[PDB]
Amino acid sequence: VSLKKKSKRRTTRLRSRIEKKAAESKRKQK
Amino acid sequence: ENVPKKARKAVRPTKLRASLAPGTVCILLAGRFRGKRVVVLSQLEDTLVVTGPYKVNGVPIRRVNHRYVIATSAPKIDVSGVSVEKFTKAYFAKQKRSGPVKKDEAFFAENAPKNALPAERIADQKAVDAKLLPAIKAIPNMKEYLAASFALSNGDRPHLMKF
Amino acid sequence: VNIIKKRTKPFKRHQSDRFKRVGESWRKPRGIDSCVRRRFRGTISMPKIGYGNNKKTRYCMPNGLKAFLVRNVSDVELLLMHNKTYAAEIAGNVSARKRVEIVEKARALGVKVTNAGA
Amino acid sequence: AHVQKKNPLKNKAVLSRLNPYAKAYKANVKINSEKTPKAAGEKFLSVLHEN
Amino acid sequence: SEFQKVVVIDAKGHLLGRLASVVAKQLLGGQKVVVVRCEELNISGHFFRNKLKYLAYLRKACRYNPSRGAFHFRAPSRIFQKAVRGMLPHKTARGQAALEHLQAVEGIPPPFDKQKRVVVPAALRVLRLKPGRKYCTVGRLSSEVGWKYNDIVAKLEERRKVKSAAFYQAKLAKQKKIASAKEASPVNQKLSQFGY
Amino acid sequence: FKRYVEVGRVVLVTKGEYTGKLAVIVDIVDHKRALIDSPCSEFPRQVIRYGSVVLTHIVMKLPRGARSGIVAKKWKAQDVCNKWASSAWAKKLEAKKVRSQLNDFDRFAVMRLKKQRREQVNVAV
Amino acid sequence: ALKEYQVVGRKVPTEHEPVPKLFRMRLFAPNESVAKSRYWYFLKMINKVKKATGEIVAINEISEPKPLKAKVFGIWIRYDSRSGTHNMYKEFRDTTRVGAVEAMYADMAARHRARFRSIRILKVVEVEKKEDVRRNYVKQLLNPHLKFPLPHRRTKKVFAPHRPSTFY
Amino acid sequence: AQGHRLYVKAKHLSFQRSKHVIHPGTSIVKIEGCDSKEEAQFYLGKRVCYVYKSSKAVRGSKIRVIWGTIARPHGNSGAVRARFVHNLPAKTFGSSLRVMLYPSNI
RNA sequence: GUAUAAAAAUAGAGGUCUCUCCUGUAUCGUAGAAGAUGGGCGAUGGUUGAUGAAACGGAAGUGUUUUAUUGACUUGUCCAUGAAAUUCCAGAAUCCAUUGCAUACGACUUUA
RNA sequence: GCGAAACCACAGCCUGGGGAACGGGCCAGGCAAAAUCAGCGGGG
RNA sequence: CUGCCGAAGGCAGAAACUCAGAUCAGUUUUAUGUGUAAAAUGAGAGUUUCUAGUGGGCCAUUUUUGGUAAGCAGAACUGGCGAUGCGGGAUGAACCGAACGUGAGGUUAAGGUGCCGGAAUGUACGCUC
């Protein structure tokens, strides 16, 4: 059983949005 | 009426397994006599001209393909004292069916060992047995081993056991 | 030589098993996004030139003789020099009188007939 | 001509045709026999077993 | 390691997931499996965490007709069956037939108490769990989640152990008699060079 | 029955190409590997992990780090060979080995012999 | 696995430098190609010698002189971390320098999430003196009366008929 | 009662398959007693038979047999690949096959 | 071969101070024209079938022991006969009727 | 006893996901037993 | 109905004829400072002519300036998509492999080997409750 309050599995928009904005973070720190 | 091309496939003698030397005790893995143990008289072009002592297990002079034969490590039985050159492919030839118009219970009554089987063939078989029995009588347990039959059981792994 | 067929199932038009207004004869799909045309998984195959059979055996019946349509005794006689490669097939509209006349002519020719016993 | 490609490396006859030298090749030759001369400079040993 | 018609597994000391996976692979292979004594299956993780896992499993129910909602089974045998069937393709005829080849029971009923009970080493807690690790018992988690037949099984198991001990003592005495006659027989030393 | 990992404990190799051989621990390399030797020539000096060996109950006096020559010397002096065989454990192992080496004719010998063993089944009344 | 190599190299001689100096390093790599590249980047970062104008003059694998004697090896290494800089010194008891390096790589990948390229080895030296050993667990192994039962006994043939022994 | 069984037991596990594609042309067979690929080397080339029974009587027998041959090992656990004269039905998953000892090579 | 029933622990168990485990690769069984027909020698045993009676087994008793009477086969060991051309694998309930404790209609509760 | 019409690709359970539009078809689960009657209208 | 060629964000094809060339290259060396010039490798290279369809946009890449709690906006190149099925990432327009005739056998890529699921409940060393 999950035994959690928040699901450990992520949606495809959410997982795609990390690589969208993680790269921009490296752009900003550059 | 086209002439086919000359195939370059020539016929060369069989290289039999070295373990299938004449005088070896072997198990039949197929046929009517499956599981029986027999003494290899000689090696024919493809099969083995073999017989189990008929006075022991009742296996007549028969050919068996070398791929259906389990060679044993049992001690060799002398066969050099009997002739084997009378066993030929023509000797074992099953004449010819000559039409499937048979089997109305008459081809089967006129069959079996009472008929068909010549008294001459019985003579060679008894002669071979007469020249083979003294050896297996001298060496212990061959008579009983040959009279018995081979069969598998629980906990038996053919890829592990060595015959 | 023997006979080899690359495929035995005939190509059915898509959705011909769903609609009766749609015939069983093959029609090539035209939609740009149709699954059949784009060849997705588990979809009925499309007639390809690669599906053709060996030329040496193409058009040949299972017994190796190509069927030749015959209507009269003249057509029977034309298979005199081709009896080893062609087999006379009786036309469906040939009457009983010409059928028995033709079939004995072929039997005298030594020409196989694929619908003789009819 | 050449209806089937036969590998000389698995077919001896084809190797014989293409290479009329395989009849006498003598791959395994004796160079060392026994009289081996152990040769390694002591400076090389020191720099090897250095550090 | 030979194909038997029925394999009786004494689930004492085993791990729920490991035994379920082994059994689920045997059923798809086509073997009838009887997992007896299911109140002794062990699960890794301390008891409070496992009870929280199970009590979270109760939470899953329909908001219309909980009669059609998830069926929460409290018996240890049914807990093992749920674990096993989750490892099988039970939505197909193959998996549905595989489930029919499994008989998970509580305790060791008389039809299976007189038959040899093999064990699975790949699921045994003693061989598969690092010492010093907390675990729990399904027969204990069941009692504190709703199972109400713990006392009867324990009583009927004490009776079974008493009867089995009496049977083994009788068989051991007979085996001692046979064992004593063994070396008394001579061929056991005369021609024993074959290793027997 | 303790089987502590001592310097000089003789052990039975159970995994690898040297399965079934008898060795003796010469040095304890670390927590999870050790150095072993044996008087038998076919088994060379090597470092082996404890997962590929089972410890025996026989302990033989042996100074640490000894060469194979005196390891054989002390092995022969205390008679470790045939002391391991004296245990019924080795008898069972060699009985299994002979039974594995056995063949079909001799299996029929065992056939008759154990039938003659079951011959008696004689129990006093 | 790993093998220890010595790589000797120099830049190509020119008129400016008729006799270039000869630089030898002892380093560990699975094969000669990795060793040469491992050496070249090391030479670049220590002495700024370009790979193009240099050449590997000698490559030699080294075998352990006494692989049958248990030894204690202390390893000085440098790590690239979040900060990009760290220095560590570990001790491993093993009969071979190569095995000690392999154990070091496995431990560091297990503990500090270190990879082969992130780890650069400064020095692998043998510590014969017992007093010079700093690590307590190494000293525990070096005690004369070491004794302990087998740890992690852990023990196709499914469906065993009897219960496991897992003892003596 | 026990003087027979010149064959070894086997189970028809599944078709040689990917995760989502099955190839019924070759099947996966698990021989009793065989637990490694080197042990499967012995059973390579042996004649495996699938014996089932049917209602209609042909040649005066209820029993029908489908022949096959072990071709190559499959995996590390001793399973093999078998090719039959007729591809085995998918309803025989987990059924029992009989691997005979011929053609023998020893 | 549709063969094999203690329990418990695994940083310990069991047996006669001593011994054993360290896996069932074990144990029981295993010949016979698919199991034929006789002759001895050695033991009162084994396989047991058929009935006939005692006890035990209730967790799903799916059976267990004890026998008795016999009819069998008695490889325990040693001998003689036949195999084959299978001549190279295959009494009840309901409707109609009745009831009103029930009831849209079924159903239900009573009588009949 | 007589006797329609609108509507009709096919249909018919829910949870999480299926980048979106989440849907009923797809993924992973809960589940799942004929034939029906009278209500109420949630879901179009 | 089948086959072949096949885009576009001036193209692809057709016909008419050059030279068996140093004639070109989404390329790398050499020399001079991404430009130009004169060795490697590959390819047969070409010129005039006319005639269909399109001239869009989404995604990411590296080069900058303007920026703010915070994202963001505007450029240039690069590719993928678009015309593209297949294996894997539980499933998916933009993630990892791989460009598709009908079949047999062998071997792999990416991803995987507890069960669902084909494949080691493999070996070795550590960490974690």
Side-chain angles (χ1 to χ4, degrees):
Chain A
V1 186
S2 66
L3 208 57
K4 304 292 311 273
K5 299 185 291 293
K6 187 255 292 174
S7 167
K8 294 207 283 279
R9 99 183 194 196
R10 286 189 270 175
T11 62
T12 73
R13 44 180 290 101
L14 161 63
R15 69 176 181 176
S16 66
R17 187 123 206 207
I18 329 297
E19 290 56 72
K20 298 292 183 182
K21 64 91 175 179
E24 184 173 38
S25 80
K26 324 322 311 183
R27 300 289 220 202
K28 186 171 286 293
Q29 58 79 19
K30 174 257 289 178
Chain B
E1 182 65 26
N2 214 217
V3 176
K5 212 173 294 292
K6 277 74 69 177
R8 289 180 186 186
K9 307 304 172 190
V11 176
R12 293 172 215 91
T14 325
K15 187 258 184 184
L16 276 298
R17 311 207 291 278
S19 303
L20 298 177
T24 301
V25 193
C26 299
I27 297 90
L28 268 68
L29 294 179
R32 70 174 301 164
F33 297 143
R34 60 182 78 239
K36 296 281 190 178
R37 298 175 175 97
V38 291
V39 166
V40 184
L41 309 188
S42 78
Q43 320 199 46
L44 198 57
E45 86 199 345
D46 193 358
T47 88
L48 298 174
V49 181
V50 69
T51 181
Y54 195 88
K55 298 199 298 292
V56 175
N57 51 35
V59 176
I61 297 285
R62 297 169 60 79
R63 296 182 303 172
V64 59
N65 193 271
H66 64 303
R67 287 302 178 99
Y68 299 69
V69 164
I70 272 296
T72 56
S73 88
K76 254 75 180 171
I77 310 327
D78 174 339
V79 181
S80 63
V82 66
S83 166
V84 297
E85 271 315 329
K86 64 167 66 65
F87 309 97
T88 88
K89 188 183 174 190
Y91 172 85
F92 285 108
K94 189 179 170 63
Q95 52 96 33
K96 184 60 175 65
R97 323 172 51 83
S98 296
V101 57
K102 278 174 183 177
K103 278 198 267 153
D104 61 357
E105 292 84 4
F107 181 76
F108 274 20
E110 179 260 332
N111 246 339
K114 293 297 97 173
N115 320 341
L117 184 64
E120 163 294 335
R121 159 77 75 88
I122 309 172
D124 322 67
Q125 163 84 20
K126 193 181 287 187
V128 176
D129 296 337
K131 288 172 169 302
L132 276 180
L133 267 292
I136 87 185
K137 243 62 181 170
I139 164 175
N141 268 322
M142 271 305 118
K143 56 181 178 292
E144 181 145 40
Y145 187 74
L146 266 54
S149 296
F150 177 76
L152 283 182
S153 50
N154 304 7
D156 263 38
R157 305 163 74 155
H159 61 289
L160 286 201
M161 48 185 49
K162 35 183 173 287
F163 308 85
Chain C
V1 73
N2 63 316
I3 304 299
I4 300 198
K5 297 295 192 292
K6 290 200 177 143
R7 183 178 160 103
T8 69
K9 278 90 187 173
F11 301 86
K12 306 294 175 183
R13 176 173 166 167
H14 186 51
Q15 275 149 300
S16 66
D17 322 298
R18 271 104 208 150
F19 290 107
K20 200 164 185 305
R21 77 213 187 209
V22 164
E24 301 266 330
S25 282
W26 168 247
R27 290 297 172 288
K28 168 78 161 291
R30 294 291 201 250
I32 194 70
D33 72 336
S34 69
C35 279
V36 181
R37 188 194 75 88
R38 279 148 76 90
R39 190 203 334 279
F40 284 107
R41 288 151 68 184
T43 313
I44 48 146
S45 296
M46 275 147 66
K48 289 167 182 177
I49 202 70
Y51 266 107
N53 320 283
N54 191 321
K55 300 201 275 284
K56 309 207 175 201
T57 55
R58 204 181 141 161
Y59 298 107
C60 280
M61 301 215 318
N63 51 29
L65 299 85
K66 296 165 229 294
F68 179 67
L69 192 57
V70 163
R71 304 161 210 290
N72 48 2
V73 169
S74 304
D75 291 331
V76 188
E77 271 156 40
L78 280 276
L79 294 175
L80 180 174
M81 45 306 301
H82 307 289
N83 45 358
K84 289 294 174 296
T85 176
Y86 280 56
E89 174 168 304
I90 315 302
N93 45 357
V94 180
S95 56
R97 314 155 87 190
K98 282 216 212 301
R99 272 196 77 104
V100 291
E101 191 46 31
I102 278 175
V103 72
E104 62 76 20
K105 183 70 179 180
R107 164 211 71 81
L109 268 274
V111 173
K112 204 152 301 303
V113 182
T114 65
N115 46 3
Chain D
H2 187 70
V3 310
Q4 194 187 17
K5 171 172 165 64
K6 291 185 185 287
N7 180 16
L9 312 163
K10 187 197 198 85
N11 190 359
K12 264 73 179 170
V14 173
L15 163 70
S16 306
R17 148 169 75 233
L18 279 71
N19 203 357
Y21 174 58
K23 189 181 286 193
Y25 180 61
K26 180 27 41 193
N28 290 349
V29 289
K30 301 287 97 175
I31 296 92
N32 283 316
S33 60
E34 45 90 50
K35 57 178 75 73
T36 56
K38 193 82 169 178
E42 200 75 354
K43 195 263 287 181
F44 171 85
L45 276 296
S46 57
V47 67
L48 183 82
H49 304 165
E50 191 46 80
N51 204 353
Chain E
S1 162
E2 62 87 20
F3 303 150
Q4 328 187 9
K5 73 211 330 285
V6 179
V7 159
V8 187
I9 300 152
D10 173 51
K12 190 258 292 177
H14 290 81
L15 293 163
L16 173 84
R18 307 299 178 94
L19 184 49
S21 161
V22 177
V23 167
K25 197 48 175 147
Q26 299 313 310
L27 300 175
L28 294 171
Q31 185 145 11
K32 164 83 181 203
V33 176
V34 180
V35 176
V36 296
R37 208 198 297 191
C38 284
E39 40 278 5
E40 301 295 81
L41 273 163
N42 283 132
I43 302 169
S44 50
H46 64 117
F47 175 69
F48 198 117
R49 190 182 146 77
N50 283 271
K51 182 177 74 179
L52 283 181
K53 273 207 287 213
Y54 198 148
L55 279 176
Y57 166 56
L58 279 72
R59 199 188 330 278
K60 327 282 184 286
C62 274
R63 292 295 90 192
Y64 64 93
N65 260 324
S67 306
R68 306 207 276 219
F71 303 160
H72 314 110
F73 277 89
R74 274 96 160 178
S77 67
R78 298 314 297 256
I79 282 156
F80 181 70
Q81 293 187 23
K82 180 208 178 307
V84 168
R85 70 178 274 276
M87 311 197 173
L88 288 151
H90 64 259
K91 290 292 182 73
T92 51
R94 189 172 86 115
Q96 188 64 34
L99 226 38
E100 182 47 47
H101 279 136
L102 175 78
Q103 190 62 46
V105 305
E106 293 85 2
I108 309 174
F112 299 128
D113 69 2
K114 285 140 61 73
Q115 320 200 312
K116 183 70 167 68
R117 302 177 279 272
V118 317
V119 304
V120 185
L124 275 161
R125 177 194 36 91
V126 56
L127 296 206
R128 287 288 322 176
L129 214 64
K130 180 182 298 292
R133 281 289 187 262
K134 281 302 303 295
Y135 67 69
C136 81
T137 310
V138 190
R140 162 148 166 72
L141 158 65
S142 295
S143 51
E144 293 78 325
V145 66
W147 192 51
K148 64 180 77 170
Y149 289 147
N150 174 57
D151 313 278
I152 318 294
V153 177
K155 168 171 62 184
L156 285 166
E157 217 64 25
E158 301 308 318
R159 299 187 216 215
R160 185 198 71 75
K161 291 181 185 182
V162 163
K163 296 203 293 174
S164 191
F167 160 79
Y168 164 90
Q169 281 295 327
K171 171 165 141 237
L172 189 52
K174 187 257 286 183
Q175 191 65 251
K176 182 62 66 68
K177 296 281 298 302
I178 297 276
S180 49
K182 190 66 63 66
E183 62 295 9
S185 337
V187 75
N188 164 323
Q189 288 72 244
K190 292 206 296 285
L191 301 62
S192 178
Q193 71 274 10
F194 301 124
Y196 287 74
Chain F
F1 293 0
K2 334 302 201 163
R3 277 74 170 176
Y4 289 161
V5 181
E6 291 315 346
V7 171
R9 176 173 292 275
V10 317
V11 299
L12 170 62
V13 184
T14 70
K15 285 172 51 188
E17 51 285 359
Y18 299 103
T19 325
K21 304 281 183 298
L22 198 64
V24 58
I25 290 185
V26 170
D27 189 358
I28 298 160
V29 180
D30 84 347
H31 204 167
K32 287 185 177 297
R33 58 162 76 247
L35 182 63
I36 63 174
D37 250 338
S38 53
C40 297
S41 62
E42 81 277 12
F43 184 4
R45 185 152 197 176
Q46 66 182 357
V47 171
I48 170 55
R49 307 169 187 278
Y50 305 122
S52 179
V53 67
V54 60
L55 316 184
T56 69
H57 29 268
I58 308 187
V59 191
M60 81 74 40
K61 272 72 64 180
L62 157 51
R64 199 269 322 288
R67 299 304 195 75
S68 178
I70 48 193
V71 161
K73 174 196 148 202
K74 305 291 185 183
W75 188 295
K76 210 60 63 183
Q78 308 191 225
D79 180 315
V80 180
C81 291
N82 314 137
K83 178 185 285 187
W84 154 252
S86 54
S87 163
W89 185 14
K91 295 178 178 60
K92 275 187 170 292
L93 284 177
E94 294 314 21
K96 189 181 73 175
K97 167 172 298 197
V98 170
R99 200 167 317 170
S100 314
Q101 283 313 0
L102 247 175
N103 66 70
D104 193 308
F105 174 48
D106 316 347
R107 267 193 256 108
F108 194 58
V110 160
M111 171 36 68
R112 294 204 64 206
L113 291 203
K114 72 163 58 177
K115 187 167 274 195
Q116 301 303 282
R117 177 250 300 265
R118 196 247 304 158
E119 171 156 90
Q120 44 94 30
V121 288
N122 286 124
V123 286
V125 298
Chain G
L2 281 180
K3 319 279 170 281
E4 43 177 331
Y5 293 115
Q6 74 162 0
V7 183
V8 192
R10 62 161 165 73
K11 65 176 67 69
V12 169
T14 70
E15 304 88 358
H16 332 85
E17 187 66 28
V19 53
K21 280 73 176 175
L22 258 283
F23 305 63
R24 162 186 178 279
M25 325 205 328
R26 294 178 56 98
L27 72 165
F28 303 73
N31 57 7
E32 281 159 275
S33 298
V34 166
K36 290 164 79 166
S37 34
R38 185 72 301 190
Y39 164 100
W40 273 127
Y41 142 74
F42 277 2
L43 194 43
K44 164 58 65 182
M45 103 187 190
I46 191 184
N47 289 19
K48 294 300 296 178
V49 174
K50 283 80 175 177
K51 180 205 207 112
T53 165
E55 57 88 15
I56 304 304
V57 70
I59 187 54
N60 290 78
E61 88 76 10
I62 306 167
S63 52
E64 188 75 32
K66 296 296 191 176
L68 292 203
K69 180 170 79 74
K71 292 158 290 193
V72 174
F73 298 101
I75 317 182
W76 310 58
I77 66 187
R78 276 264 314 149
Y79 194 11
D80 291 331
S81 294
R82 305 181 190 177
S83 64
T85 178
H86 203 247
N87 164 343
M88 321 173 170
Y89 159 64
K90 303 271 299 310
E91 302 218 22
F92 306 92
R93 187 164 160 88
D94 162 349
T95 61
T96 313
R97 186 179 297 112
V98 170
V101 166
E102 286 177 351
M104 171 295 268
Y105 267 109
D107 165 288
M108 212 75 48
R111 292 182 192 284
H112 310 114
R113 265 62 180 175
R115 279 74 175 183
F116 184 85
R117 284 61 50 91
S118 302
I119 287 171
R120 72 202 201 240
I121 297 162
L122 291 203
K123 179 171 211 328
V124 182
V125 71
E126 195 280 334
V127 174
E128 186 270 324
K129 276 72 56 185
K130 180 179 176 69
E131 298 77 12
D132 283 28
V133 171
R134 315 199 222 166
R135 296 326 169 191
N136 200 241
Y137 61 93
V138 179
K139 276 190 171 180
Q140 187 35 9
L141 305 167
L142 271 283
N143 286 118
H145 292 347
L146 201 49
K147 68 179 178 65
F148 52 100
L150 289 175
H152 194 358
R153 74 282 189 191
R154 181 201 83 120
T155 180
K156 304 289 98 175
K157 47 169 69 76
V158 73
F159 296 156
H162 292 289
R163 288 269 169 170
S165 69
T166 180
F167 208 20
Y168 284 118
Chain H
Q2 64 183 177
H4 316 93
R5 187 171 90 73
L6 281 103
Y7 59 93
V8 72
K9 337 203 161 283
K11 311 298 282 183
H12 179 217
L13 283 191
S14 65
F15 290 145
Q16 182 251 346
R17 66 174 290 167
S18 73
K19 201 187 292 187
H20 296 298
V21 185
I22 54 132
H23 292 76
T26 165
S27 309
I28 280 157
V29 169
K30 180 67 173 66
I31 296 92
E32 181 256 349
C34 186
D35 286 330
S36 68
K37 43 188 205 291
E38 328 77 50
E39 294 196 357
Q41 286 300 316
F42 172 79
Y43 301 106
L44 294 175
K46 301 287 179 287
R47 186 97 172 271
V48 64
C49 68
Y50 174 57
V51 165
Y52 57 108
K53 69 180 72 72
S54 81
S55 63
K56 204 192 71 83
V58 65
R59 300 195 64 78
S61 173
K62 300 288 95 175
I63 291 284
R64 327 210 190 176
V65 189
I66 287 184
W67 303 114
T69 278
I70 297 89
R72 55 198 264 158
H74 193 81
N76 304 297
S77 308
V80 308
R81 305 200 201 173
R83 253 194 277 286
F84 290 73
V85 299
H86 304 317
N87 291 318
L88 291 176
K91 63 102 173 182
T92 73
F93 282 174
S95 280
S96 297
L97 279 44
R98 301 144 68 138
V99 179
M100 271 85 78
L101 296 175
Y102 59 85
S104 72
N105 314 327
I106 187 164

